[PDB]
Amino acid sequence: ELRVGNRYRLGRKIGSGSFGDIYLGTDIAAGEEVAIKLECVKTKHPQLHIESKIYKMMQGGVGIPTIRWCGAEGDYNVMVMELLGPSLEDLFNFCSRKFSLKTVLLLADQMISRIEYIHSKNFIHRDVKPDNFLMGLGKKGNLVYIIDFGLAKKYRDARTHQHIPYRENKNLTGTARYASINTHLGIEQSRRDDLESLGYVLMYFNLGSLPWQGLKAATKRQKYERISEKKMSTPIEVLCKGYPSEFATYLNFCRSLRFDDKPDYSYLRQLFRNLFHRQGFSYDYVFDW
């Protein structure tokens, strides 16, 4: 039978991205289902092995998937991961693209913490979006995991904590829908951008769509300009109209961080915790789904 690593049976393709395809797999040793990421060896962009190193650097952190095997086999670089549950985009669609405020706030608290953990390990993620957060399986079904480190990079030296240098004139990295304003402006990403993107993710969950989503264009050149033009022309107070002020406060705080500033993650969690209590919610892990 077809097995990567002599050990993982290849199953159906369950996802695609710029940095490889993802397949279901089965560990023949245990019958454990896994996720198998494949990257063609003849790729412009040797990346998967770097992503695997970052996963190894983050192992043991709460909400970080476990890497089971990496290696080269045939025409592919292979990374085998623990299989997680549905993504938040999956669950959003499952819930008919409506999440309650309670579910949004339960998710926000964990997502801020996942991003903080990555930053604590000296990396920025650079591709924060609903598809890249997955719920755990079974017992860990209440835990939000973060995936996809294919665009991640160090923002500071591990020993000296010297921050990487500021630059402009950069081409867009990440996804147009959730990228920070500064990314659209060509500015080097830093910690603040991961958190701004999360702010757009949270308003997406509240609204069902973002105002710069689904714009008519033709070229990809012109489409990203359309998005960058809309995102900038929509004030945060307009974006967040009809929702608690904490969401605007969150976004304004992220936009006000300087390039090398350390975010106050505890402040941002407490904005939403305070709202959670005001609403009378209990942190009982009853999500909408």
């Binding site: 710029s18 081409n171 147009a176 989503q213 998005i227």
Partner: peptide, 7 residues
């Protein structure tokens, strides 16, 4: 608009 882009 949802494609992962590289620098």
């Amino acid at each position: 608009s949802v494609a992962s882009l590289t620098s």
